[model samples]
Target: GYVPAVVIGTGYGAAVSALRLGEAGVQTLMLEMGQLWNQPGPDGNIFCGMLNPDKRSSWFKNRTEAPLGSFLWLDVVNRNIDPYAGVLDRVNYDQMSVYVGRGVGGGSLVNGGMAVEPKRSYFEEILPRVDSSEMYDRYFPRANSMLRVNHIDTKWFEDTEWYKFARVSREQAGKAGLGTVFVPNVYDFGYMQREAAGEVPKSALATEVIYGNNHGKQSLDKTYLAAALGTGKVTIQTLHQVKTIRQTKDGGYALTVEQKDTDGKLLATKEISCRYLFLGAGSLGSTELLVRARDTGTLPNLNSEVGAGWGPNGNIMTARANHMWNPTGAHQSSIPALGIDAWDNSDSSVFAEIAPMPAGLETWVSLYLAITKNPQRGTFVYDAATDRAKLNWTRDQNAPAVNAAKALFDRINKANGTIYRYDLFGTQLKAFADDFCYHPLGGCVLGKATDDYGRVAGYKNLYVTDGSLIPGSVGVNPFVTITALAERNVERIIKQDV
Candidate 1:
């Protein structure tokens, strides 16, 4: 099979590319390694809940793997089930593990719906060659509007029981002289208000995040991909993985793709060619393809920077044990609406999102996922024996992140007369969960591995329009940045290269 253009993966960046390409009257095909997630099973729900999970909650695993590993040193969180291609996957490495989504919408299917823009100063420091003024004035607003980014009503939030947990954490941070700001989200706030009033079916209130949201989430499937399909110029093939890439004799690119079933059985292999190739397979997936191609001599012109500049986005998770009198809440919303804004504190600039336990009971806990200013980085080395890319990050590499998170939380705990939770993570006294990350950034970096606008240096029609272009950190959620960058780059490509 052949097409005029091919976009890999259906994430934030790829969805943007597909929609823009379709609008430009280009015939495009998208290859996804996951399912479309529009079907319901015997339970009549598209996804399972976080409390009671089944095979639909994991990706080709015999049991479910959740981020909250344990609660009170008990193994009551995970369950065993048959192997299948589920929504979320926790890819394990030697010292670091990355969590990614496995459906048509990619990470948007499983994330917390926090749509944040990076601070303007930090954005300039990260991508100095890119035009930050144009991004702030034009592309950022364009991406936010198309994604339907909205805010939680402050009046409702002040009175709703679902946000009591967030309020508790905010008050505690306020005691430490820190300010909290409302974070924008992609979840429909009107739908959530209706759910609270018992006028609609419960999705976010039913703990239906991290597996998949049954309703109210404006994921790419409902926004960008939906519009791309409306153009009648783009088509998507699910459960099809692109295995290898090489230049054809005619100077186009040929891809070896494999189709598989939900049970992990291989069905068929395919050879697809295209004149223009866009790699939006995320930070890990895109980097692996380019690394293997460069090292195996198939795409011999790819440079050494293909596998460099990888990082875990300075992620660290920790929890606080409030006093018995200070109960967080019995009912909590899965969408986080507020963040501790200490980014200017210079001592340990950190932005900690006040998270929820949502165990359906008051556990007297306040959890947080902190994003710090750690400058450490990791590299990916391709191993030919196993045919995999291995990250060379160690536990010690996360020390700077842990120190920054600890510095901020320590102040909050002292001001609020609280202590750390030692029993929730299955470790005796360990507080921070630094081994895994939900935000994986870099690998194929902009201005170094490629041009400032994301064109691969040695290739004519190759482009990268994903989180792979950002180097390490975005000072906030990376999806908005990824979408805006894709919008900026693909507009140039369609105008000049097409």
Candidate 2:
């Protein structure tokens, strides 16, 4: 049976595509390179695999059916299978760390769940071919509504220590005359309502999210993907990795897939043909696929932009206000409820966003961190030997922006809005290097490698709908923008019946 559409990587892009395609009466198959969450662990936690810190470390120890350790392992696994040869091999770059979710929902499984609409100007700049006004009227609101995006109110914000951290950052930003705003999130407070009813454990209170939240804080498995499944038009194949994509004579795609057992061992390899193929495997996953196809001459007609214009989306981190203030009995869990946006369109140096963190991880002392708009660009090079996409990035390119971020922090500290001191996490903070943010972007870029709508320029029915298409940074959390762009691209492809 030739499926009309095959959406890869059940992350935001795939999930949104699944929901939209399924609703549009297109027979869709959603393929995930990770496992699904269903069973309960000994700790009585749902087996999301993400909340377990040992998931990645214990990958080889677990059954093949287990979720891959750390979402980055997906690319690591893909590169291990098919290798790429490049001018400067990037396979060994330490800075090329890839972070994503594996499993039915992809990175949405472990994302921070901050659902930020892209800055209008930045969104317009990336895809000027798509009418922004029409998208705002047609798709943006639809996407947000379906995702249940909303702001955490003042009451909930005041009660949570995470919110307090955001407030402290906001106050400091105000002193420095920087701007801030409360970012909306995809977290459904209904789960918090369940916690209130004792039906589920409290998250954002007891669970620190980045490591994973057991009680369902910011998860897409329970949101978009769940709905797509309910429609009965979408089938999800978990623990299955797409090995390769070959173009069909009819201008479609024939994907080779390997199904794995619980022990992470391959059980079978199968070929499935589809009329339309969507690569939502993210920047790393999508880029590696295109690169390998091009390098091997499997899909040689792929655009020359396949490996160009790669960036970590200008990532930089800034830590400020080391003063300790204990709010009695307040649970400073990792879920941040507030954010400060000091976004300056004119000056890249002054661009930054502030969020709160728990004292337990780095320092129990009060600290506000900013992810600044640095100019460091990273590239993902496919390694044929290791079959891995190696990331290569340098901090020297970002020095100017880093300095600008420090100056902003200094102003906030002097104004008494925040404080900055040394070595909060002891030697760890001291050893901390710059240009390292778990968030990664680029590899298979749009307009350069693919067309404006993310169709790989020379390929028919091959599309990229994920962070890889984001041209650069918006100086903020990137999920909403990623999802929105995916929404935009998928919608366009469907309209064209590609």
Candidate 3:
């Protein structure tokens, strides 16, 4: 029998792999734990209800379609799942805990959509052993073209009030003599223009995106998923959660699948088999499964590094210039139009170019930013009794990349650039933090648990292709990077098999 290729998630990496595999004449099955957002709203938009106020219309909102929320760390208390031993105390049990994605497009549905290409130097440093020049010249451009990465030029950067807030931060960075650059984004500005025309009622522009943006942005659901379906060989089963994976004697995997109905009811449990398995379930989801499989003795011979080297990449949220304003609302139109790249080349630190939210009906409006430094490595442990995996993360002392950030912001704050300290959207100035960043990475790193090609060191016919494979922080939004890596891995797999 010709078994299908089973892809565990419908995220950018998974979707791209499934599509490519299907094009290679392999039957592809994409299992999504979240529901689809096909229901249209009164506003004539596909209603995923991520950040919308109406609960009914927001029905599919939190179950995986919502952005950032899909990737946020929830406490064990919220999920009622037990934490892995030695990682937390009794009090920490209630915390839901960790980053993950569910539903059709997985994390791409709720991410910041900041499609940044990592610096060439940083990529070289992280994958010092791998040949990335080909990736940089070939697959990198392919991924960017597929994602439609584009930058907000000077005119729009200057004309838009949302960008002004970013400019204010740039001034503060300039005052401190910090370097800054306008990073490209995956958000579609043309859609934002449509929203302004009332053709679309401000889903992406009016909404605060960290939680989830309904429209005016490009998510995997609208990109990779669409392209995958175009192949006709890829079948997507939403709300179908995988319970267990068993390797058959014939070198195939039998997956136990539980399907859920619209009202959150379990419809049925079915068994499907696949010849090749690609786990694109992000860091937590994929790592948890591998740990469970190994710990339960279902696949005990798995690599010793399965749960090692997990990192949130020393994530922090900090802000600057409480009183200074580079037109706070300039960059708040819908998508992030500008960014600061002062720390991209630094070996010891990394700071993001950030934009603050515009004041809507609220009093205090401020820009949000994150400064990351020194990867804080962690690990995942399997809990057999509760049938869950626990994450143990500790902060690294080498953090606090703030000194360089402060220096940059100080320069910009003093320069009083026109892009800063102005009221473009009739909003008041406020304070923010520098330690918060939406981009999260690591766990089940490449070369540790899996080889450079994402093949698990000891497992046959099993592979990982997601953000978890990234060894360290790329100091930028990581979608393009992950996808390119997946492309590289899948291409190798195809060549080996053919």
Candidate structures ordered by lDDT, highest first: 1, 2, 3
Kindly list the per-residue Cα lDDT of model 3 for residues 45-133, writing each as its tens digit. Answer: 54433334232222233322222211121211122222111100111212223444455777675566777777788788887766878
Residue-level lDDT of model 2, residues 154-231, one tens digit each, is 676666444555666665567777777766777756565455456876765554454345665556777788888888
Per-model TM-score versus the true fold = 0.98, 0.84, 0.82
Model 1 lDDT per residue over 1-498, tens place: 899999999998899999999999999999999999999976899998887788988888887755473355224667888889999998899999899998898999999989999989889888888999999999999999999999999999999999999999988888999989999999999999999999998988887888899989899999999999999999999999998999998889999999999998999999999999999899999999999998988899999899889888889999999888788888888888899977863537798899876587878888898988888888888999999988888989999999999999999999988899866666577899888889999999998889988888789889988988999988787899999999999999999998
Candidate 1 scores a C-alpha RMSD against the true structure in Å of 1.2
Q: Quote the lDDT for 300 in model 3.
A: 70
Q: How many residue pairs in model 1 have overlapping backbones?
A: 0
TM-score of 1: 0.98
Task: Name the lDDT of candidate 1.
Answer: 0.89
Q: What lDDT score is found at residue 342 in candidate 3?
A: 57
In angstroms, give how far residue 230 of model 3 lies from its true place: 1.4
Q: If both were scored by TM-score, which would come out higher, candidate 1 or candidate 2?
A: 1
